[PDB]
Amino acid sequence: MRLLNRHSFVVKRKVSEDGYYNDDGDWVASQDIVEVNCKGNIQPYIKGSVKNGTQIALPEGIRLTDTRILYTTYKLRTSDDVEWNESDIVMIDGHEYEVFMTMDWSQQLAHTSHYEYIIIRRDKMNAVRNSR
Amino acid sequence: MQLETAELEKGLVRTLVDVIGHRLARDKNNRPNVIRAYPSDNSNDKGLKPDQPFITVYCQDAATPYGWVLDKFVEDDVVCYRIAFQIPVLITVNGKGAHSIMLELKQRLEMSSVRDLILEETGATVLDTGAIPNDYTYLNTDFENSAPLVVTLVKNSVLKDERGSIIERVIVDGELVYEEGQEPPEYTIHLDVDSK
Questions:
Q1: Nearest CA distance, B136 vs chain A (angstrom)
Q2: For a designed S-S bond to B21, which of A86, B32, B105, B127 qualifies (C-beta 3.0 to 4.6 A apart)?
Q3: Alpha-carbon dihedral A45, A47, A52, A55, rounded to 10 degrees
Q4: Is A59 in Cβ contact with B142 (below 8 Å)?
Q5: Are the C-beta atoms of residues A12 and A89 closer than 8 Å to each other?
Q6: Inter-chain contacts counted by CB atoms under 8 A, chains A and B
């Protein structure tokens, strides 16, 4: 419906699910990454000690943590060790948001079936590769 | 001299104004900001936090590791007692550069001077001086740099026993006997000695 499609964002799904552990023990993420276009709705998540755009003071400097809730009809998936697949990524404001939680309301009713996700801004860190 | 921490704290506060007053902030009266801990007046009024940097003086406790009584003597007809005490004190600097100020305060308490002024005011001697940590406490918004220090003091206190009295006359009696328990004594000696 109209309100469920107010926002348009990009989603990076690792289509391949062939991640494995090297002969040295390091983790190697699935190789084939694919970009997609999706539509949904993004709002701040107000609950308990959740931190939306909260500035954090540390001895090392300053951080910024954010988290949101997303309503959409697209089936995004989080990490699953039994099915052996990794989570998706959602691009908001040019930054990455990793899908951490999911709530399956699909197949409940005709016109109001949807999904809910809690997406957390990814922390800043340097990059390293282990590919075999 | 009697031992009262209320006076030791005041003496230390008065001494620090001259010793380390040049590094501290100053109030509306131009006096450096040195205060006693837990300020209050009239049994419910509470003082406000001064402008940084400032110093706080707080007496922890008092103990008698040196025996229980040092001297017992007579000064005038009233009896007297002397007791040795030890008093650890805590001095903290709040603001920016608290460590840089505590270091200089340490380096001045060890001089031949300053230790004479402390004894002139409080009548106590500096015995020891502990290490200085470099603390940070979040408060709200921004951290506050602090630097506590412990300075132990030693003082002797004297009190007057108003219930005491002195002996100024002695009466003595004695006997002599050839054998133990001789019921009629061979001789008896009676003596009396006055102070005058």
A1: 9
A2: B32
A3: -170
A4: no
A5: yes
A6: 5
d(CA B24, CA B56) in angstroms, rounded, equals 12
- In terms of Cβ atoms closer than 10 Å to its own Cβ (0-12, 13-18, 19+), residue B131 is exposed
Instruction: Find chain B residues with C-beta within 8 A of A55's C-beta.
Output: none
Q: Give the 3-state secondary structure of residue B170.
A: strand
Instruction: Classify B61 as helix, strand or coil.
Output: coil
Structural resolution in Å: 3.1
C-beta atoms of A57 and B136 within 8 A: no
Which residue type sits at A86?
Answer: E
B8-11 — which CB contacts under 8 Å span 24+ positions?
A: B8/B59, B8/B87, B8/B89, B8/B122, B8/B124, B8/B153, B8/B155, B9/B36, B9/B57, B9/B58, B9/B59, B9/B89, B10/B36, B11/B118, B11/B121, B11/B122, B11/B123, B11/B124
Is the minimum CB–CB distance between B68 and chain A shorter than 8 Å?
no
SS3 B108: helix
A119 is written with which tokens?
Answer: 């997406």
How many C-alpha atoms does B83 have within 13 Å on its Cβ side?
17
Residues of A with CB under 8 A from a CB of B: 57, 59
How were these coordinates obtained? cryo-EM
Smallest CA–CA distance, residue B124 to chain A, in Å, is 41
Measure B149 CA to nearest chain A CA, in Å.
Answer: 23
Q: Chain A residues with CB inside 8 Å of B141's CB?
A: 57
- DSSP β-bridge partners for residue A38: A9
